[PDB]
Paper text:
A byproduct of castor beans (Ricinus communis), ricin toxin consists of two equal sized subunits, ricin toxin A subunit (RTA) and ricin toxin B subunit (RTB), that associate through electrostatic and covalent interactions. RTA catalyzes the hydrolysis of the N-glycosidic bond of a single adenine base within the sarcin–ricin loop (SRL) of the 28S rRNA, a conserved hairpin-like structure that interacts with eukaryotic elongation factors (EFs) 1 and 2, during ribosome translocation. According to the two-step model, RTA first associates with the C terminus of the acidic P-stalk proteins (RPLP1 and RPLP2; “P1” and “P2”) of the 60S ribosome before being guided to the SRL. In this study, we report the identification and characterization of 11 alpaca-derived single-domain antibodies (VHHs) that recognize distinct epitopes on the hydrophobic surface of RTA normally occluded by RTB.
The interface between V9E1 and RTA buries 1864 Å2 and involves nine hydrogen bonds and six salt bridges. Two key hydrogen bonds are present between CDR3 residues Ile-106 and Tyr-108 with RTA residues Arg-234 and Arg-235, respectively. FR residue Glu-43 and CDR3 residue Glu-109 established two salt bridges with RTA residues Arg-234 and Arg-235, respectively. V9E1 also inserts CDR3 residue Ile-106 between RTA residues Tyr-183 and Phe-240 similarly to P-stalk peptide residue Phe-10. V9E1 has an Sc score of 0.62 with RTA. V9E1 occludes the P-stalk binding pocket and forms hydrogen bonds and π-stacking interactions with residues (e.g., Arg234, Arg235, Tyr183, and Phe240) involved in P-stalk peptide recognition. The analogous disulfide bond was absent in V9E1, despite the presence of the requisite cysteine residues. The addition of V9E1 resulted in a dose-dependent reduction of RTA attachment to BSA–P2C11. In contrast, the addition of V9E1 (13.6 nM) resulted in a significant restoration of relative light unit, as compared with RTA treatment alone. Vero cells transfected with V9E1 were ∼100-fold more resistant to ricin, as compared with cells transfected with LNP.
Author numbering:
A (entry chain B): 4 to 7, 10 to 122
B (entry chain A): 6 to 259
The structure:
């Protein structure tokens, strides 16, 4: 069930965690879906590096990071715009680095409705 | 030339990943990085002693063959099995001189009249890439097929199908992170399957993506390139950022 409001220029942090997954050894990716559109790739972090990847439209605004202490991946969102309104999803996979080309991943997190006014 | 050894016998996700990483390491020795993606060197002024990489493949039946990969485009140009070497038709006279430096100790050398492009190899195989299964099983059988070609035990269709296998599992996986990930999952779940249209569309677009990336204005394309998602839906790509997770190597354009 989608979890589900932010002021323009506001902040929001999403969390990727699952009790069974040692995320420090997974590739993690974030996607977002507007009501009438497909799921758009936002950002990924690679397992076998610390290497981070961003769509151009979020560069300098969104930051992906791993907290290995709490076995969690975060997407920190700053300078939010109405155009960022969407349901956000994280994905994780040991073998595939999440990207726009596919949605076949071992793990998909629960969605979160983000609404920028 | 640099040699990378890989065996299908007991292959794991890790051992295949180590293999593709070493191939990438050898391919990009002379590469430079444009928009965070290594660009393979072009042939101009590239020394002959640095033109090729060798990939030695073994299987459970203890048969081995050695592929020669071109470092300018990661593609298979030929192979050696025992006392025989077979090369695809070179596209010019300079490349014909180039391949005379491969496998110089074999007694029997043969150049096919045809090239190794997919349209040709599919004509000879009698099947399209869409119906040729990939995986550790198909690769092990491809090795045997290549080995016995000099022996007279492999027919032309089976040989072209084996080339299609090797090129996708090695050359295309070296070029594309996405395709390497797809081969890892086949190994992880011990399964064989033909590539999907999204893999095939991506393979067909490698040259065009390299052009758009290298001619781009700090990431943004002059014009969009259509790609195919794995679920079949088609999407436009307008910026290099979207491709960085997908593509590991580019061919030179400048
Ligand atoms: Cl084997
Ligand atoms: Cl050689
Ligand atoms: Cl011929
Ligand atoms: Cl055909
Ligand atoms: Cl096809």
């Amino acid at each position: 069930l989608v979890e589900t409001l932010v002021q323009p220029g506001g902040s929001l942090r999403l969390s990727c965690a699952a009790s069974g997954l040692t995320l420090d050894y997974y590739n993690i990716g974030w996607f977002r879906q507007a009501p009438g559109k497909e799921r758009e790739w936002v950002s990924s972090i690679s397992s076998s590096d610390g290497r981070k990847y961003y769509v151009n439209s979020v560069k300098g605004r969104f930051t992906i990071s791993r907290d290995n202490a709490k076995n969690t991946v975060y997407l920190q969102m700053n300078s939010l715009k109405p155009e960022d309104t969407a349901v956000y999803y994280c994905a994780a996979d040991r073998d595939r680095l999440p990207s726009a080309i596919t949605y076949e991943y071992n793990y998909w997190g629960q969605g979160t409705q983000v609404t920028v006014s | 030339y640099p040699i990378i050894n890989f065996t299908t016998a007991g292959a794991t996700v890790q051992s295949y990943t180590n293999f593709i990483r070493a191939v990438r390491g050898r391919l990009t020795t002379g590469a430079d990085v444009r928009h965070e993606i290594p660009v393979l060197p072009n042939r101009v002024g590239l020394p002959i002693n640095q033109r090729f990489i060798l990939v030695e493949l073994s299987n459970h039946a203890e048969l081995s063959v050695t592929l020669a990969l071109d470092v300018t485009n990661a593609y298979v140009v030929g192979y050696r099995a025992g006392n025989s070497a077979y090369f695809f038709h070179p596209d010019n006279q300079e490349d014909a001189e180039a391949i005379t430096h491969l496998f110089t100790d074999v007694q029997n050398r043969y150049t096919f009249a045809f090239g190794g492009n997919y349209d040709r190899l599919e004509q000879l195989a009698g099947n399209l890439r869409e119906n040729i299964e990939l995986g550790n099983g198909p690769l092990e059988e491809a090795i045997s097929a290549l080995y016995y070609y000099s022996t007279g035990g492999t027919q032309l269709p089976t040989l072209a199908r084996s080339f299609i296998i090797c090129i996708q599992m090695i050359s295309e996986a070296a070029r594309f992170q996405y395709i390497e990930g797809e081969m890892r999952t086949r190994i992880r779940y011990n399964r064989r399957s033909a590539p999907d249209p999204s893999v095939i569309t991506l393979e067909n677009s490698w040259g065009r993506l390299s052009t758009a990336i290298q001619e781009s204005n700090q990431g943004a394309f002059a014009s969009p390139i259509q790609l195919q998602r794995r679920n079949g839906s088609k999407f436009s790509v307008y910026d290099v950022s979207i491709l960085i997770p997908i593509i590991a190597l580019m061919v030179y354009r400048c």
